[PDB]
Amino acid sequence: STECSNLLLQYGSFCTQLKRALTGIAVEQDKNTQEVFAQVKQIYKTPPI
Amino acid sequence: CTLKSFTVEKGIYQTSNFRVQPTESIVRFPNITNLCPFDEVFNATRFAS
């Protein structure tokens, strides 16, 4: 709703707070997997035998 | 604009939202040609008591 879009700007910049907050969560999720699953400097492949 | 700084460092930043603007507009209304006899109600003799 275009009229509603006009009204939203009046209420303030509440959206920017949410985008900042949610982004921090999203970044941390990738970081969490990094710390757990990336602890080897070199990929090791098992011997054929 | 988002970072409130003239200089921006390396990285990826959430900025805004994009959406397709509508190309045009369509109106579909019922196709009955009979003029609705409002006139008959107002234009009359002595109204009901």
Swiss-Prot record, chain A:
The chain holds residues 746 to 794 of 1273 of the full protein. The lineage of its organism: Viruses, Riboviria, Orthornavirae, Pisuviricota, Pisoniviricetes. It comes from the Viruses. It comes from Severe acute respiratory syndrome coronavirus 2 (2019-nCoV). This is Spike protein S2. Precursor of the fusion protein processed in the biosynthesis of the S protein and the formation of virus particle. Mediates fusion of the virion and cellular membranes by functioning as a class I viral fusion protein. Contains two viral fusion peptides that are unmasked after cleavage. The S2/S2' cleavage occurs during virus entry at the cell membrane by host TMPRSS2 or during endocytosis by host CSTL.
Curated annotation (Swiss-Prot), chain B:
Residues 19-35 are annotated as: Disordered. It comes from the Viruses. Glycans are attached at T23, S25, N31, N43. Changing N43Q: Reduced viral infectivity. Attaches the virion to the cell membrane by interacting with host receptor, initiating the infection. The major receptor is host ACE2. When S2/S2' has been cleaved, binding to the receptor triggers direct fusion at the cell membrane. When S2/S2' has not been cleaved, binding to the receptor results in internalization of the virus by endocytosis using host TFRC and GRM2 and leading to fusion of the virion membrane with the host endosomal membrane. Alternatively, may use NRP1/NRP2 and integrin as entry receptors. Binds to host ACE2. RBD also interacts with the N-linked glycan on 'Asn-90' of ACE2. Cleavage of S generates a polybasic C-terminal sequence on S1 that binds to host Neuropilin-1 (NRP1) and Neuropilin-2 (NRP2) receptors. Interacts with host integrin alpha-5/beta-1 (ITGA5:ITGB1) and with ACE2 in complex with integrin alpha-5/beta-1 (ITGA5:ITGB1). May interact via cytoplasmic c-terminus with M protein. May interact (via N-terminus) with host bilirubin and biliverdin, thereby preventing antibody binding to the SARS-CoV-2 spike NTD via an allosteric mechanism. This is Spike protein S1. It comes from Severe acute respiratory syndrome coronavirus 2. The chain holds residues 301 to 349 of 1273 of the full protein.
